[PDB]
Design a protein around this nucleic acid. Structure first.
Lengths: 85, 43, 72, 247, 60, 106
RNA sequence: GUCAACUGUGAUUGAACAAGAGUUAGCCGCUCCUAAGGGAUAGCUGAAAAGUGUUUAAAGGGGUCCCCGUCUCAAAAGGGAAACAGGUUGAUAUUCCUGUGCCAAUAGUAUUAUGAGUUAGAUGGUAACAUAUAUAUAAAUGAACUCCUUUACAUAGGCUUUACACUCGGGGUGCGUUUUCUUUGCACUUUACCUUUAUAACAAACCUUGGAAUCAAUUUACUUGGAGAAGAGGUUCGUUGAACUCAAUUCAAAAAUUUGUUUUGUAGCAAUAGUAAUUCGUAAUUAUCCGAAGUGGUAAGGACUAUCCUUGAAAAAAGGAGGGAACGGCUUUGUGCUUUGCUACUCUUAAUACUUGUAUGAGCGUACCAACAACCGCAUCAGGUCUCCAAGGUUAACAGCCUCUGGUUAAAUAGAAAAAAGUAGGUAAGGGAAGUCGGCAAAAUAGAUCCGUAACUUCGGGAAAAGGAUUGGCUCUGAGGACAUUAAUGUUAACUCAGAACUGAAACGGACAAGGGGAAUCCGACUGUUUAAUUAAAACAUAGCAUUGUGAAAAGCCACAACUGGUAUUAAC
């Protein structure tokens, strides 16, 4: 936080790799390391344990999700569509 | 090396037995020998 | 090796037919204390007898068939 | 001269796939009488990662229809699948995400994954992460169904052939750029013997025909016919148009 | 032992004798850990003896 | 001090070849190969190590008595006690729910 | 024993020559299991040779005729039951010897003892869970058919516990210094497996109660909580392995069985064995052997936390659960099956006797070297050659320097003389790159602490920029703990920091290690890689950008003579 001006969480990368790539990495990593709200117990502890899998620690349960975030806009729309029909 | 095989051990013991010098009495009625440092068994 | 607290059980183990020998030794001041270790094939069973009166009573009580071993 | 790398790859050798991390073949449930006439509901008991596949596998328990006790399958995990999710498979199964249904029983414009080119071939198509096919039409007298491949291509398959409702897990994986050469190494370590991927033009012309030239010339067309010999097929085979794509 | 007697008197130590970093001489994390454990120990004793309330304890 | 060595070879500290140095009654500092420590047997659903069951290696678990191995309560070491209860509730209530459906239907 | 030749000098030496001796295993390895792999059967091709390997099969196991099934070799560091302590030889010892154990099997029948159950399958605990202490924790019904689990696993960072090691201080022993001074220096003060070791202790996990926003409990780190936290009281696992009342005894109290006090005891193993001693000669005795603590170096475990577009072998073998097939003994009709009449019997460990092939422990390895001469290098070759063990002082330090244990003073030679010249080194007035291909070589810089730090910049860096200052020895002062007496007073510790005097040839990172820098241009972005013995770069890789083809067994792309493979445990992310 109160260390770097603009590179923030990609400051560990900072001395290496193109700035635009570090910008692209920053957006993805912000999503990646976020702790999501669990549908199966109501706490914001849901973390990614491997690429497609987001596990709640508290209720010990594996939700399949996107690579860098819990759900794609595509899957939500598909789910919604199926309920709609 | 340090651990051994029964066939190898037997043959090596044979080669050692063969190595030792001729009976002196035989000359009264020695062409080949090996030395371990300069001649290995070639096995 | 196994410590046996119960003297009566120790006597019972002595009376058992597998048991063969009595290793008994007196220990000096740090007063005489006596350690008796009793030899069954399965284990060597140990009782520490505090005083002479205990020690004489056990030595007499033990069967005469048992082989008595003294280090001196 | 000396055999080119792509031709050398088919001799088998050290170019066989790196299957050690991989958890078994990812083929769906086989067709049976119970699937054909009715439906079976199963429970997703665990979700597991395979690195050869782009997305997780799902361990699904069914109970042996012909016998007794519990039997374990390996399905490709749909996005929004969860441990303890109930998965239904068969002709009379209800329409819902991750269910395994004949394509004939999908309403049009639905999004599906794990298609098979023939019934009971066990999900041979549409297997990669984040991917999906769309149902684009249903035959008037039935029997055939029209679907749209994730390439955007349209194809007509029999209605009887199965597919799996929804989109494959681990979507957006390609969106992150590759950070570094070690990350690329870790990717190829679980894939195939295929890397570093050296330029052909750099080499001797003897050992790659794009090679030679004192200042690294190509010296000949890079657009090759599909009628060409295998050792001549180094360049861009059957290239209809070249240059930057535009329009 | 004469040197250790000098070290006990604090006299063996000297500024230019040092060649290790300030951290290598005495570890900052370790010093922090000492202070935290003593402060938390102190707070718990004050709570146990009930000379402060839970609110004051937690804030401190 | 002094130097030491293994009496079984395999001096590299592998998964199985671990060692505890020890001083003898002869005053000799020697090395003894220490028995292989393990992880713990797990509840079926939750993958959680179970109360009342000892974590003994499978040789020691073969030599161990049945009281050491398992618990009289319900499905023993298979699944944990809280977990069993909830599953029993679910199995009973769903049969009740099924019975309500049967009553409703006719 | 030894000296013909060899031991690039000498040689009485020897890793040379001659004569013998010597390696001892139910428990250590191999041996066993599966893997990456390899070889085949089944097939099918190919003149054959071969190329392939469940793939168009009438095939190893379990069950009262039925149900299952490709085989086989492949790890001396993966998996894998089970042994240690002391002694001993001219040479081996986990293996010989003495002591103590541990493991697997261990047939039939009859006896016996051990606990069960009967007049066909124990119990407690609300619960988490617990319960057989028989010489011996043995024995706590259960078939088919099922389901789990152990085997069985990444990396990084801290935190923590134990052990060995290391240090100080005290008592005890002997030796050493001892003009002078030293209540001094050194040495020794030992303790294993095994006893599901018994307990104690603690990080965790779980349970009963409990019912929380004024959030609390709480770690270095954040963690946890009405999907029940704090609190209170338990229970379990794992560490550990005699801790602690642990056991005995004693007297006092509880009480028809439990606590307090005394006396004992290295908990058994265990002192008889080890060590330092002490006397007495054919080889024997005697005396000794223990009180506090600190450092945090090794190693292991633990609880954790974080990272991966990478999530980190398997089987043999072993274990747990589901299920509910089966079921007293005697007498008797009818057909091993059924109904009547009667009531010490049915289990279960261990021991014994008697019979049945001879009813216990397979086979192989175990010397020595591991290079300072034993291996590879054509050779006692300054070369190469895997792994573990890791003392003291200085210090950040497994660095460098010196030291103790242990080792050595041999290196294909010595002596005498000492100039050139050589080679490995030093050193040099005054100037300071005028040198040459080029400051090459060499020198200067250099450690810490305190200051101060620019252009420029993808804002991360630049950077230890640049550029300064300080640093010895002594005598003081301050800061930083732990325990217990009601805020003060006591008992008591490790070392590190900061400040001040004095002191000296201002010398002091003293030896020791130890950036030369700046201003620029140019190329390659980068970490990476390369021409084994004239080549490390500006070449190559690399992320990034873009392109082509391909929707699938009649596809793409590649292999094979053929049949057939590979990409492919694949599927347009």
């Amino acid at each position: 936080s109160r260390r770097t001006k603009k590179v923030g969480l990609t400051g560990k990368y900072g001395t290496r790799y193109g700035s635009s790539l570090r910008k692209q990495i920053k957006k993805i990593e912000l999503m990646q390391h976020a702790k999501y709200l669990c549908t199966f117990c109501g706490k914001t502890a849901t973390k990614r344990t491997c690429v497609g899998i987001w596990k709640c620690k508290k209720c010990k349960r594996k939700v399949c999700g996107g690579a860098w975030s819990l759900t794609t806009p595509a899957a939500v729309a598909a789910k919604s569509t199926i309920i709609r029909l | 090396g340090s651990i051994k095989r029964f066939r190898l051990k037997q043959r090596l013991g044979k080669c050692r037995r063969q190595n030792r010098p001729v009976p002196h009495w035989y000359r009264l009625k020695n062409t080949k020998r090996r030395h371990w440092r300069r001649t290995k068994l070639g096995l | 090796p196994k410590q046996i607290t119960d003297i009566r059980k120790f006597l019972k183990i002595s009376r058992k037919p597998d048991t063969t020998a009595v290793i008994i030794m007196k220990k000096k001041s740090k007063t005489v204390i006596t350690k008796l270790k009793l030899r069954t094939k399965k284990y060597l069973y140990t009782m520490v007898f505090a005083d002479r009166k205990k020690a004489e009573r056990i030595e007499n009580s033990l069967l005469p068939s048992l082989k008595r071993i003294y280090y001196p | 001269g000396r055999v080119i790398r792509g031709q050398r790859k088919g001799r088998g050798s050290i170019f066989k796939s790196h299957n050690h991390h991989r958890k078994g073949a990812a083929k769906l449930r086989h067709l049976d009488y119970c699937e054909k006439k009715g439906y079976i509901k199963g429970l997703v008991k665990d979700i597991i990662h395979d690195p050869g596949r782009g997305a997780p596998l799902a361990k699904v328990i069914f109970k042996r229809t012909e016998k007794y006790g519990k039997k374990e399958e390996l399905i490709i995990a749909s996005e929004g699948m969860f441990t303890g999710q109930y998965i239904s498979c068969g002709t009379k199964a209800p329409l819902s995400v991750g269910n395994i249904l004949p394509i004939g029983k999908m309403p049009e414009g639905t999004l599906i994954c794990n298609l098979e080119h023939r019934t009971g071939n066990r999900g041979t198509l549409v297997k990669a992460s984040g991917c999906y096919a769309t149902v684009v039409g249903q035959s008037e007298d039935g029997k055939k169904t029209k679907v749209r491949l994730p390439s955007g291509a349209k194809k007509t398959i029999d209605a009887k052939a199965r597919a799996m409702v929804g989109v494959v897990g681990a979507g957006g994986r390609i969106d992150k750029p590759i950070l570094k050469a070690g990350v690329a190494h870790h990717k190829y370590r679980v894939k195939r013997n295929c890397w570093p991927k050296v330029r052909g033009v750099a080499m001797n012309p003897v050992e790659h025909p794009h090679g030679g030239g004192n200042h690294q010339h190509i010296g000949h067309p890079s657009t090759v016919s599909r009628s060409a010999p295998a050792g001549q097929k180094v360049g861009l085979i059957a290239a209809r148009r070249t240059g930057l794509l535009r329009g | 032992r004469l040197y250790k007697l000098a070290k006990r008197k604090g006299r063996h130590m000297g500024i230019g004798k040092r060649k290790g970093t300030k951290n290598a001489r005495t570890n900052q994390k370790t010093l922090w850990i000492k202070r935290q454990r003593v402060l938390r120990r102190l707070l718990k004793r004050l709570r146990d003896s009930k000379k402060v309330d839970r609110h004051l304890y937690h804030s401190f | 001090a002094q130097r030491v060595h293994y009496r079984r070879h395999n001096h590299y500290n592998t998964k199985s070849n671990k060692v505890r140095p020890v001083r003898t009654p002869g005053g000799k500092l020697t090395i003894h190969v220490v028995k292989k420590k393990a992880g713990k047997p797990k509840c079926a659903d939750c993958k959680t190590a179970i109360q009342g069951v000892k974590a003994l290696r499978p040789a020691d678990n073969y030599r161990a008595r049945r009281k050491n191995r398992t618990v009289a309560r319900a499905y023993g070491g298979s699944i944990c006690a809280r977990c069993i209860r909830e599953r029993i509730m679910r199995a009973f209530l769903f049969e009740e729910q099924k019975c309500v459906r049967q009553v409703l239907k006719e």
